[PDB]
């Protein structure tokens, strides 16, 4: 199995820890952890292309999209590799993350190691927002916290 | 060419930006950037195995050593892949980093993307300290700052 991890930090209250595990080469990736300091509701959750946090989350670039598709939700055929949908924060501002995804990987060209995980201010509309931006970014607003996805033991 | 980047953060503030560039997979990696907030002199400079900064630099694990060798300096045949020697801070506490290394890579099993770059409190003795620890860690003392090495544009 391969494992990865990411510490989410930003300029404000949002912080988190996210773990990734992939038992088989080309098998699904389990994503789990916790994010706090969020407003209650849905928050866009994306792998962005660059693991460049030199200017914070703004240096991370666009959604990780090695297969040149439009933006969608994780259960859509038409999605970016980095489109992990939304995490859900409760009224305490805590998101307990538990995702299984078949498109991201921890090896090869769908590999997300060395890229940036970002949690957003607003909900990702999953390409169903009714404007042009919806099928590019999902209209998820500001980047509240991010980190580089690293190899874990 | 492949490019990578790392933001080093640690108390001081010890803060740095380190860039990596490799023109072909068979080529050396150019490592350049700046680290500030250091004491004047030599500071050990290592790629540690895990890109895990969940508990700060301590979670990064040992020196990246995929070939099961002893610790050395960068110009030694007997070294860890992660053994980048020392950076040098001036009397303003600034290390201007300029290294070319032939052993680290931005691809393959010597790949350092997704691992942790660490700058240390003391000088790396490069395996020439005269105790057992010298040929494992180089006696470079505490981890001052670190970050996960990410893919850059
Ligand atoms: S997982 C990963 C993360 C960042 C850069 C490269 C990789 C990677 O595993 N790439 C591979 C491509 C082709 C064959 C093996 C590995
Ligand atoms: S470059 C990289 C970054 C993060 C995880 C894995 C890799 C990688 O490509 N590793 C390889 C090991 C052995 C053979 C090919 C690739
Ligand atoms: Zn995003
Ligand atoms: Zn997207
Ligand atoms: Zn070290
Ligand atoms: Zn070493």
Residue numbers in the entry:
A (entry chain A), B (entry chain F): 1 to 153
Relevant lines from the article:
A subset of ALS is caused by mutations to the gene encoding superoxide dismutase-1 (SOD1). While zinc binding and an intra-subunit disulphide are not directly involved in catalysis, they stabilize the molecule’s tertiary and quaternary structure. ALS-related mutations reduce the ability of SOD1 to fold, bind necessary metal cofactors and predispose it to disulphide reduction, which in turn prevents its normal dimerization. Dimerization, disulphide bond formation and metal ion acquisition are the canonical SOD1 PTM steps en route to forming a stable and active enzyme.
Here we demonstrate that ebselen and its analogue ebsulphur bind to SOD1 at the Cys111 site in vitro. Ebselen and ebsulphur were found to form a covalent bond with SOD1 Cys111 while derivatives with a benzyl substitution on the benzoisoselenazole or benzoisothiazolone nitrogen did not, possibly due to altered reactivity or steric hindrance in the dimer groove. The 1.3 and 1.5 Å resolution structures of wild-type, zinc metalated, disulphide intact SOD1 bound to ebsulphur and ebselen, respectively, allowed for the unambiguous placement of the compounds in the SOD1 dimer groove. They show the formation of a selenylsulphide or mixed disulphide 2.0 Å covalent bond, respectively, between ligand and Cys111 created by nucleophilic attack of the free Cys111 sulphydryl at the electrophilic Se–N and S–N centres contained within each respective heterocycle. Electron density is evident for both ligands except for a small part of one of the ebsulphur phenyl rings which projects into the surrounding solvent. This indicates some rotational freedom in this group. No ligand conjugation was observed at Cys6 and the intramolecular disulphide bond between Cys57 and Cys146 remains intact, as does the conformation of loop VI. Ebselen and ebsulphur form tight interactions within the SOD1 dimer groove, and a hydrogen bond is formed between the ligand carbonyl and a highly coordinated water molecule situated, on average, 2.55 Å away. Ebselen and ebsulphur appear to form additional inter-dimer contacts through parallel stacking arrangement of their arylamine groups.
